[PDB]
Design a protein around this ligand. Structure first.
Ligand code: HEM
Ligand code: HEM
Ligand SMILES: Cc1ccnc(CCc2cccc([C@@H](N)Cc3cc(C)cc(N)n3)c2)c1
Ligand SMILES: Cc1ccnc(CCc2cccc([C@@H](N)Cc3cc(C)cc(N)n3)c2)c1
Ligand SMILES: C[C@H](O)[C@H](O)[C@H]1CNc2nc(N)[nH]c(=O)c2N1
Ligand SMILES: C[C@H](O)[C@H](O)[C@H]1CNc2nc(N)[nH]c(=O)c2N1
Ligand SMILES: [Zn+2]
Lengths: 411, 407
């Protein structure tokens, strides 16, 4: 069965056959759509089919489906599973796995880049100090003095779920948030709970507005430990505006390297619970969400005050106006400092081309419109006008519960 | 079965039980979400009749009353005999108010209960339809102080005798393809504009020519009528601090009135039911003006502002987009025509959801449509999980009649 998606700007209609190879589920039914819901132990039993399937895909992409090397690898994974209950991925398969998990990330507008991904195999890692070393190398390599490069670092897979490797930070680099006795927040409200955990684990908090949090690292199911990323490894960009000279006086900066460290990487049934990945920012992530969400730095009021906009009625669109300037300022600061960044027009146009190519060559591109459309200027970007099919493919990145909720403390 | 929605900005969490009363289907499966696709007999009719009457009599706290039961028998008899039935006025009104209440794509539903319903089931001709429509237009415009209304023509019978307003809105601008290869006026309406010309309309061939009404009664060939201009309230668009803005030539009409939709009450199909309210600023400023495929004015506006259009990264489109939208709001407010900005409308819809969760057990809502097409994340609906599901009575889309009508 085929499925059509129309682009309502261009009349381009594409045809999906890839949704056919879909395994996992959506959350939706014939009677309810969960498309805007944010967040919708594995025995031998269920493990071999998932392995077989992954290995079938892998050998297809390398044009060796049904080869002796294909068959022998199935027979070997089979034996290894029944003998040891799990199995190890070869390097090539781990690489192919990671790439495809990015490729299959239907909420990611950045996927044109999916095939250029540096994979660091950290499966020999055994300790948190080991983890910290790996991560520092990741950060240095991906940062590359501003000319950002995609990278992922993959720590050992889950075994019995009592020996998980985890990175407690939700991103490798992120700003502290501090709840004050008066109810206000200093720094980034998104990270208050994690900041508290750090202070509790012995971190001395500078208590400023932009303090880079320490890495908090769990190896082999052990209690996690603190490590300060060397400051020389953390590239930050002071934010100014090309025409507003008072803008720098707002005291704002951001870090250059977006690196998510809380997701789980599923490949051939195996679960990598610590698999930090990084790329580069789309301007709106910092300028719309990080700065202007009501639950983040929330600078809108202060930027509008400074621009002396009519703030007495919302119909003056003083919010929209400030929002655009802040976003102009973020892009201008990054480009000026030669730190890779993409604006939302360019990213979305690129993604439409990628999506078209993926239909031509792969037979589909799963895509989550709710997430793909940018959080400002939605309809002047071409994705807004693009129908999308969302469905779940493996390999995949999945959410997992925060470790402090599930972790069994050794003491 | 009992479902939770979460506002990620406020942590408010609501529980949805209303979706269990869901009759219609979404287009989604467990395998594939279709949340962003634009468009997904006596024996059939009686269950539909009952569902409706059951909810009707429930709302008036008369479920399981003689009045309830007898109506059901009365309708049952009429179905058994006539193969259709007629709604009482009260049911018709309740029906319409609820079709709007269930429109999961409408951000403006806080207002749903204040709909004025004009029952035009006694209409027999296009001239009659024209008369009902002008009355609806005038009443709804209210010298700029807009009022919600729906006018309801006779229901489907054998699908050979359909009443249809061929226009997609009662008031829209003409679209003319040109020897240049580009378009004059509104590109959305180019085909309907050919149908009008190819029916007999002398087209002024301007940028902003009010289309004629093209009305079909009882399955007959449709007819042209020009809405008295004194009844078409229009706003010239200017900027609160850009003198040159007015020279861009822009105007828009005050009354948004969708005419091509099909209203379904208790299994009955009203294929001609034009309805109107008032504009959210962005509909005109973002979509009508700035859609590449609509008036697409961003290029020209940015020029006049002398912004750097050399790289996408200056955000000049964005910058112009805001100004354009400021000017729409400003012009409407200045001319005292009702209009709501996207901040205030979305805020109201949050209050409305709260109410619907508390009073009804939920509120079907389609996030992809509710979130405005500019400044999404700075409005509160962005952060609001919404459950989308289809309830009846409803408005549904229907094929364009020129594809269907037999001459
Ligand atoms: C190359 C630079 C990149 C850009 C501009 C980019 C852009 C984005 C943006 C804007 C989002 C939405 C996130 C939000 O608003 O919170 C996103 C989500 C995502 N991205 Fe990419 N991305 C890039 C690289 C990558 C890489 C290297 C991976 C994985 C290897 C990745 C996987 C994902 C996943 C898994 C999500 C959403 C998680 C979910 O909620 O399911 N991204 N990305
Ligand atoms: C009171 C003023 C009103 C405002 C500000 C309002 C706002 C909106 C907006 C912004 C949309 C999105 C449509 C688009 O982007 O083109 C919408 C869709 C809709 N509205 Fe409302 N609305 C109002 C009154 C009404 C009334 C009176 C009805 C019916 C009685 C109604 C029924 C609908 C339907 C059926 C859709 C979407 C149709 C679909 O695609 O399924 N609206 N409205
Ligand atoms: C449950 C929940 C609640 C709130 N936010 C989230 C999303 C977390 C997240 C995941 C991937 C990318 C990003 C982005 N904000 C950060 C990012 C990462 C990468 C690799 C590239 C890029 N351009 N940007 C954020 C989840
Ligand atoms: C294929 C296709 C593509 C795009 N749109 C459609 C449906 C048209 C439509 C339906 C309801 C409201 C509106 C709105 N654009 C017009 C409107 C109507 C009312 C009553 C209030 C208001 N504020 N605005 C338009 C179909
Ligand atoms: C409730 C809603 O699903 C939630 O706010 C989503 C909407 N779309 C998003 N889109 C992106 N890119 N990032 C987000 O965090 C969100 N948040
Ligand atoms: C492809 C996508 O479904 C299409 O662009 C939709 C998205 N959201 C929308 N939202 C509103 N309010 N109006 C629209 O016309 C659309 N169009
Ligand atoms: Zn869905």
């Amino acid at each position: 069965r085929f499925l059509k998606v129309k682009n309502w700007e261009t009349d381009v209609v594409l045809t999906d056959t890839l949704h056919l190879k879909s395994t996992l589920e959506t959350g939706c039914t014939e009677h309810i759509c969960m498309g805007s819901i944010m967040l919708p132990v594995r025995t031998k039993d269920q493990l071999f089919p998932l392995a077989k399937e992954f290995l079938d895909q892998y050998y297809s992409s390398i044009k060796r489906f049904g080869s002796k090397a294909h068959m022998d690898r199935l027979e070997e994974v089979n034996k290894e599973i029944e003998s040891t209950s799990t199995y190890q991925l070869k390097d090539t398969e781990l690489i192919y796995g990671a790439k495809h998990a990015w490729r299959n990330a239907s909420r990611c507008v950045g996927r044109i880049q999916w095939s250029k991904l540096q994979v660091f195999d950290a499966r020999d890692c055994t300790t948190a100090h080991g983890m910290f070393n790996y991560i520092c190398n990741h950060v240095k390599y991906a940062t590359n003095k501003g000319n950002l490069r995609s990278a992922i670092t993959i720590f050992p897979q889950r075994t019995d779920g009592k020996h998980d490797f985890r990175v407690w930070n939700s991103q490798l680099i992120r700003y502290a948030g501090y709840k004050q006795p008066d109810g206000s927040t200093l720094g980034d409200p998104a990270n208050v709970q994690f900041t508290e955990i750090c202070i509790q684990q012995g971190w001395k908090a500078p208590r400023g507005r932009f303090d880079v949090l320490p890495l908090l690292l769990q190896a082999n199911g052990n209690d996690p430990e603190l490590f300060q990323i060397p400051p020389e490894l953390v590239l930050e960009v002071p934010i100014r505006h090309p025409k507003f000279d008072w803008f720098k006086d707002l005291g704002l900066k951001w870090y250059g390297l977006p690196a998510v460290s809380n997701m789980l990487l599923e490949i051939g049934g195996l679960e990598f619970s610590a698999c930090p990945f990084s790329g580069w920012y789309m301007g709106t992530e910092i300028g719309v969400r990080d700065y202007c969400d009501n639950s983040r730095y929330n600078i809108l009021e202060e930027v509008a005050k400074k621009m002396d906009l009519d703030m007495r009625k919302t119909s003056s669109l003083w919010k929209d106006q400030a929002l655009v300037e802040i976003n102009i300022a973020v892009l201008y600061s990054f480009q000026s400092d030669k730190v890779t960044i993409v604006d939302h027009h360019s990213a979305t146009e690129s993604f439409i081309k990628h999506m078209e190519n993926e239909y031509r060559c792969r037979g589909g591109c799963p895509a989550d419109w709710v997430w793909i459309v940018p959080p400002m200027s939605g309809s002047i970007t071409p994705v807004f006008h693009q129908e999308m099919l969302n469905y779940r493919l493996t390999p995949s990145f999945e959410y997992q519960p925060d470790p402090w909720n599930t972790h069994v403390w050794k003491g």
